[PDB]
Amino acid sequence: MSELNALLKDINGSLTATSESLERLSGIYSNSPAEKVSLLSLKNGSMLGYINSLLMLIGNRLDDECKDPSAMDARERSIQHRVVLERGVKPLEKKLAYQLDKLTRAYVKMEKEYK
Amino acid sequence: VSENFLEKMMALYVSSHYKNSPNDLQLMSDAPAHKLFVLLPPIDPKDGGRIPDPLCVIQIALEGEISKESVRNSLSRGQRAGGDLIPWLISQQFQDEEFASLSGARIVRIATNPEYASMGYGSRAIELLRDYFEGKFTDMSEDYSIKRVSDKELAKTNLLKDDVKLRDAKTLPPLLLKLSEQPPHYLHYLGVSYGLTQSLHKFWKNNSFVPVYLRQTANDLTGEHTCVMLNVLEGRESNWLVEFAKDFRKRFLSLLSYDFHKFTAVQALSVIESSKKAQDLSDDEKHDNKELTRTHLDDIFSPFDLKRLDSYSNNLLDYHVIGDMIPMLALLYFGDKMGDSVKLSSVQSAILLAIGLQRKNIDTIAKELNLPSNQTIAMFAKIMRKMSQYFRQLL
Amino acid sequence: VSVYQVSGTNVSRSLPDWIAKKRKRQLKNDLEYQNRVELIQDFEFSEASNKIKVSRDGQYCMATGTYKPQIHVYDFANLSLKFDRHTDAENVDFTILSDDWTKSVHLQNDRSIQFQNKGGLHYTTRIPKFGRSLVYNKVNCDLYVGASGNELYRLNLEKGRFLNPFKLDTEGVNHVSINEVNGLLAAGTETNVVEFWDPRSRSRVSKLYLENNIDNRPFQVTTTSFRNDGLTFACGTSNGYSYIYDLRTSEPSIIKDQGYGFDIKKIIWLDNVGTENKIVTCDKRIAKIWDRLDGKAYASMEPSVDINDIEHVPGTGMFFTANESIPMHTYYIPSLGPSPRWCSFLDSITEELEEKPVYSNYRFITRDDVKKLNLTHLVGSRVLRAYMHGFFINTELYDKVSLIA
Amino acid sequence: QSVQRDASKGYSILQQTKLFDNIIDLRIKLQKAVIAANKLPLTTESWEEAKMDDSEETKRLLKENEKLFNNLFNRLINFRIKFQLGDHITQNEEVAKHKLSKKRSLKELYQETNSLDSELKEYRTAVLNKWSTKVSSASGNAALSNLPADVQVENQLSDMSRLMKRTKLNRRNITPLYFQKDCANGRLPELITENPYVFDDEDFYRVLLNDLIDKKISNAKASKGRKLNYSVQDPIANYEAPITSGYKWSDDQIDEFFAGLLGIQIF
Amino acid sequence: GISRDSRHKRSATGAKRAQFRKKRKFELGRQPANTKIGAKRIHSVRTRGGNKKYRALRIETGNFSWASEGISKKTRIAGVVYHPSNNELVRTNTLTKAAIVQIDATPFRQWFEAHYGQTLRAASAKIESSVESQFSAGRLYACISSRPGQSGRCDGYILEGEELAFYLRRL
């Protein structure tokens, strides 16, 4: 078997597995007034873009032409999304960890009390 | 409603204090630096907004931020300005002008419901109070000033026709505020001042407070010594506390003979241990104890003294022959000069501390520790055998 | 720290105790045997010791034996055996009602409760079903006896009458303990649940369902203990974990495992000694002292032979343990606290003692559990240390892998 | 009544944390694709030679790869348009709904990615500035007035040259197919170990795995006495006498403790 | 204190007998020997005459007999699984006669492989399915046929056939 054939099979298994997990995740989100934490929404949105940039890097490479083998655009987008997650979100949420745990703890006790 | 809550606070506030009831109320209400905190049980929504009874009440007074120029002028003149007890006291004792500039809060009073004492509510309140000033209680939801009586109203009113009424409930803020609502003031340390007792010291010791000053003259009314302990909040420079803690320990060790001889060996030992905890607070190795040098050992003890010690460790000598060397050995051990090689148990530390520093007799320690004199002498001998072996290893 | 074994079997496990003494008779020429120090004469049961308890007066000790089943009472002042009293059947549990040795209640294995007085056996009574534990309430003056049945039988010494037994939801109570300051009661059921009862009324205040994320296998609550302060509670699970609970909260403050997977027999709070945040947890194999708040091992006592019980003389560093061997091991930790008053000069001879010495700090896995936990790939690495049939592991890392598996 | 909002806030926080874990699971599955992708050829000639090795099978795999890749990303953009819509990240609801309904091409799918990233950038600035002010006010830094989070992001994005080099580091030592042939033929302008074409996010991937692992850890018949006889037994009668003082705690304290065992605007 | 006299008991008619004499030494009993699995501890008891009895207070090995193949091997005892008289003895791991215990299968397995040259001619090597299953498990069910409290041994035999099926139902 050719090396490309084995490699392409691995991508096929990865892509279908990712799609199935995406199918589950979207369905759970679609099932979900409740207002969310803007930081953690930005945290969720930021790394989602990082996955897209990683997938764009996969897409650029997968093309047989390979006009941009370095995937500069996919890199820059991944670079942006990685930076916000690490340098911006993490210091803030660390300051916010104490209060965030307090609220999540509060509901669990209410949930146990309700049951 | 406010009066009912105020009565509940003051009963808790007045729960344990010695007859100085009246004036403090005028201090709480009028004084600007003073702030009041209350620990309340969980609020049942089914109660329709009824006030729960306070478990713990803490009164803090903001202190510090004194201009360095004012400190120098007053210190030279020897005049103590009203308020700011801890900043003035530390500056006088340590002659440090930087400390007075630091912003801090003094815990004026902490009171817990006596029926509920020792259940850990007081420790909880301090922990929350420290977290509050550390900035952890940030607002998670995405004004409280009141208009004063204007001069126009004062000029337009006639004495006979004055309608002096309670302020409208709409203008007033809520009686109880969440910590997140009101931002804290920036503080560098938390300070306490109290008479040193085993119970109170253990309470503050467990709350990460470090002793910095102990008054030599006992208070006439209580017979207790005023002790000032400091706590540094996270993210703020902590070196200055370590230097003060080291100096206090040296002062304490030498002063055990003069005026703290009355203190029990266990109480004195605990005070040293609490101060050492400040050194563990500093992860830096810049300020460290220095192990005894051979040249410095020679100066302290002549070769005959070392020979005399070894004979006693071998039981070839009487206890009295070595009585002269004990206080110097105590200073070296409790000064941490001997290092990791030599370590002693709590009882052995009490025995060495009593003979070496308090200068108590061996029989007196036997009574205090509820040990026979035979055990006390034997345990003391084991201390010197360890100490002697250390000197041999250095040599 | 340092642990000194004042008495016990200095010989290893495979060596049998009985041969050693005959060979010791041949080796009587040895100077060390002549210079040996025995704290208490005749401090050894014929073949093994079941239970040992120190009188609240502090001047006496009592213990129970294997064959012929008997009760030994030791006088510390005379450092010897006051008397030995044979019994019709072996002893499961017992308590000393008086401050001295005079009055005690003994729960035999033949379903009978025997009341021992100064002169001899005062009275013997039989409960409906086999008992496993016993406790006595001073205020209510009632003796509570667990049993194989669900009922927790109640006997009143003042009225000399059996009374209504408390009905536990589960079948069986492995251990029963009473809280002196509070009066609460605990019962260790066979299922992973502890039921709390009130002696004032007769009502089940609540139950705790012990939760073990690390181990999913079933387990029993072998032992329970109440701290002196009264707001803290200790449990022992048959799988080999110890839970410390603050009674007001419903979650375990700390879960520390002994590591050998054996049952936890006894839990003692070393509040008297100083630095009250120390606790003792005992298996058959090992009994370890560790810090209450943080779970750091202070010291460890590994006798060669199994441990049936451990008892601490209050206010002192000395511990007595009832073992499977002929001698009853006693351990002295000078750091923990001073030696008892009665053996005052034990401190002077600390050098001569054995000064016995890792097992307590680290966890141990069986070979079968390694395969289930997918730890086979680790085998041959520094992270785990080989001990006999199984391989040791770090406590935290075991929790992560068992959560993974 | 404030407790309910305190609760509903907790559920919203909790949902997102599950959404956090699920997306990282998506990343975990995609990890082998990124590793495999980095092993693919880099030039037209190398790709053609790779196909020449097995023309029929490679063509079939390429068609399936293209189909799955297009279907996966089109759904991902659909999830994005819905996701940034629900969280108020995008304000134009009608435009978002139209984008979801319409089927998009690869070039169009690229355009939505650019638009979504641009919108996310604007939301990022507003959120970071807003909450940095909150944390500053909460900690007393407002009284003091340690850079703003948005400013730190801008500065690190300004230091773009340094951070590409981090991505270009070949920690895994991945050699793409026909890399040596492309190097020898001079088909790789950027090169003419740090490889511009091999992308490495191993440290970031491991950091995420460690965070997820830690979070899971932290969150994680009468005869023989067989019947009971209640008649008085004389020998043990008055064996022991009750203590009159009673329990150390007062009954009112006992009643309270047992109850809680095991768990003008005033406010 | 333990006695075997019948004088304390009621007569057949139901009359309550009065004490006829004191307890004698020719009608005595001794405390039960609660044998348990562990390091071997045995106590010699001087009985009537010069004779002696051995009190196995603890015993961890026993000579167990595979009757079908007519062999006996010394094996370690793992634990008591079932006792017909009382389940408390099962709970406490007390060894007495008729107790069903679990024993190591290593010596028996080695003997079978050595004799028949087959891992556990083919007809002879064939054994019951249940016994083979136990061998696969690593522990064999056996019944104690000795009286440990009298002879100081824990000898027994491997369960087979109807006995094995019956006890397996009981388990």
- Is residue D242 a contact partner of residue C141, using CB atoms and an 8 Å limit? yes
Partner residue facing B138 (CB), from A35, A38, A96? A96
Q: For residue C20, give the nearest of C309, C327, C284, C302 by alpha carbon.
A: C327
Burial class (CB in 10 A: 0-12, 13-18, 19+), C254: middle
Question: Residue D220 is encoded by which pair of tokens?
Answer: 């994680």
Compare all CA atoms of chain B with the CA of A98 and give the residue at the minimum distance: B136
Q: For residue B370, give the nearest of C344, C229, C99 by alpha carbon.
A: C344
Residues 6+ apart with CB under 8 A from C344: B372, B374, B375
Chains A and E touch (3+ CB pairs under 8 A): no
B28 labelled binding-site residue: no
Rounded to whole angstroms, how far apart are CA atoms B142 and B160? Answer: 50
**Alpha helix stretches (DSSP H) within B95-178:** 97-101, 121-134, 151-156
Query: Is any Cβ of chain A less than 8 angstroms from the Cβ of B183?
Result: no
Chains D and B touch (3+ CB pairs under 8 A): yes
Residues 6+ apart with CB under 8 A from A55: D30, D72, D73, D76
Q: Is residue E42 located within the same domain as residue E23?
A: no
Rounded to whole angstroms, how far apart are CA atoms D221 and B309? Answer: 79
Rounded to whole angstroms, how far apart are CA atoms B392 and B395? Answer: 5
Question: Residue B138 is encoded by which pair of tokens?
Answer: 């940030």
- Which residues are paired to C145 by β-bridges? C134, C153
Residues 6+ apart with CB under 8 A from B114: B15, B16
- Is residue D49 a contact partner of residue D186, using CB atoms and an 8 Å limit? no
Cα distance between the two ends of chain B: 76
Partner residue facing B49 (CB), from D142, D253, D267? D267
Compare all CA atoms of chain B with the CA of D13 and give the residue at the minimum distance: B140
Q: Is residue E46 located within the same domain as residue E15?
A: no
* Beta carbons within 10 angstroms of residue C189's beta carbon: 21
Question: Residue B301 is encoded by which pair of tokens?
Answer: 């003890």
Task: Identify residue D39 by its one-letter amino acid code.
Answer: K
Q: Is residue E6 located within the same domain as residue E40?
A: no
Question: Residue B393 is encoded by which pair of tokens?
Answer: 């290893």
Q: Is residue E25 located within the same domain as residue E92?
A: no
Residues in D lying within 8 Å of B, measured between beta carbons: 1, 3, 9, 130, 134-135, 137-144, 253, 264-267
For residue E157, the enclosing domain spans 31-105+139-171
Chains A and B touch (3+ CB pairs under 8 A): yes
- Is residue A4 a contact partner of residue D178, using CB atoms and an 8 Å limit? no
- Is residue C220 a contact partner of residue C210, using CB atoms and an 8 Å limit? no
Q: For D127, list phi and psi in degrees, rounded to 5.
A: -65, -50
B245 labelled binding-site residue: no
Experimental method: cryo-EM
Q: How far is CA B295 from CA A63, B326, B394, in A?
A: 78, 20, 11
Cβ separation of D266 and B176 shorter than 8 Å? Answer: yes
How far is C-alpha D2 from the chain's CA centre? 29
Compare all CA atoms of chain E with the CA of C305 and give the residue at the minimum distance: E39
- Whose structure tokens read 């563990």? B280
How far is C-alpha C177 from the chain's CA centre? 13
Q: For residue D41, give the nearest of D187, D243, D238 by alpha carbon.
A: D187
C-contacting residues in D 169-228 (Cβ below 8 Å): 213, 216-217, 220, 224-228
Q: Sheet containing B189-195: give its strands across.
A: B34-39, B56-64, B103-112, B189-195, B226-232, B210-214
- Is residue C322 a contact partner of residue C331, using CB atoms and an 8 Å limit? no
What is the H or E stretch that residue C136 is in? Answer: strand C134-137
Partner residue facing D238 (CB), from C125, C140, C160? C160
- Which residues are paired to C167 by β-bridges? C151
Q: For residue E108, give the nearest of E78, E131, E92 by alpha carbon.
A: E131
Query: Is any Cβ of chain B less than 8 angstroms from the Cβ of A95?
Result: yes
Compare all CA atoms of chain B with the CA of D264 and give the residue at the minimum distance: B169
Task: Identify residue A64 by its one-letter amino acid code.
Answer: D
Cβ separation of E32 and C148 shorter than 8 Å? Answer: no
Peptide bond into C68 cis (omega under 30): yes
- Is residue D135 a contact partner of residue A43, using CB atoms and an 8 Å limit? no
Cβ separation of C206 and D262 shorter than 8 Å? Answer: yes
Compare all CA atoms of chain D with the CA of A38 and give the residue at the minimum distance: D127
Q: How many CA atoms lie within 13 A of B282 on its CB side?
A: 21
Rounded to whole angstroms, how far apart are CA atoms A74 and A52? Answer: 8
Burial class (CB in 10 A: 0-12, 13-18, 19+), D234: exposed
Query: Is any Cβ of chain B less than 8 angstroms from the Cβ of A2?
Result: no
Q: Is residue E97 located within the same domain as residue E146?
A: yes
Q: Is residue E9 located within the same domain as residue E90?
A: no
Question: Residue D60 is encoded by which pair of tokens?
Answer: 């079939």
The angle that helices B265-281 and B346-353 make with each other, rounded to 10 degrees, is: 110
Return the residue in E2, E46, E57, E150 with the most chain C beta carbons within 10 A, the one to mutate for interface testing: E57
Size of interface A-D (CB pairs under 8 A): 283
- Is residue C303 a contact partner of residue C17, using CB atoms and an 8 Å limit? no
Query: Is any Cβ of chain B less than 8 angstroms from the Cβ of A104?
Result: no
Partner residue facing D134 (CB), from B2, B45, B139? B139
Q: How far is CA B25 from CA B7, B38, B133, B166, D36, in A?
A: 11, 16, 25, 20, 75
Size of interface B-C (CB pairs under 8 A): 27
Q: Is residue E25 located within the same domain as residue E58?
A: no
Q: Is residue E22 located within the same domain as residue E54?
A: no
B112 labelled binding-site residue: yes
- Is residue B2 a contact partner of residue D264, using CB atoms and an 8 Å limit? yes
Cβ separation of D230 and C140 shorter than 8 Å? Answer: no
Rounded to whole angstroms, how far apart are CA atoms D150 and D163? Answer: 18
Compare all CA atoms of chain C with the CA of D258 and give the residue at the minimum distance: C205
Kindly provide the b/e burial profile for residues C263-293, where b requires at least 16 CB atoms within 10 angstroms of the residue's own CB.
bbbbbbbbbebbeeebbbbbbbbbbbbbebe
Q: Is residue E24 located within the same domain as residue E35?
A: no
Kindly provide the b/e burial profile for residues C139-149, where b requires at least 16 CB atoms within 10 angstroms of the residue's own CB.
bbbbbbbbbbb
Q: Is residue E72 located within the same domain as residue E151?
A: yes
Q: Is residue E25 located within the same domain as residue E47?
A: no
In C, which residues are within 8 Å of D240 by CB distance?
A: 97, 103, 141, 157-158
Q: Is residue E53 located within the same domain as residue E83?
A: yes
How far is C-alpha C222 from the chain's CA centre? 11
Q: For B259, list phi and psi in degrees, rounded to 5.
A: -125, -15
- Is residue C363 a contact partner of residue C257, using CB atoms and an 8 Å limit? yes
Rounded to whole angstroms, how far apart are CA atoms C143 and C97? Answer: 10
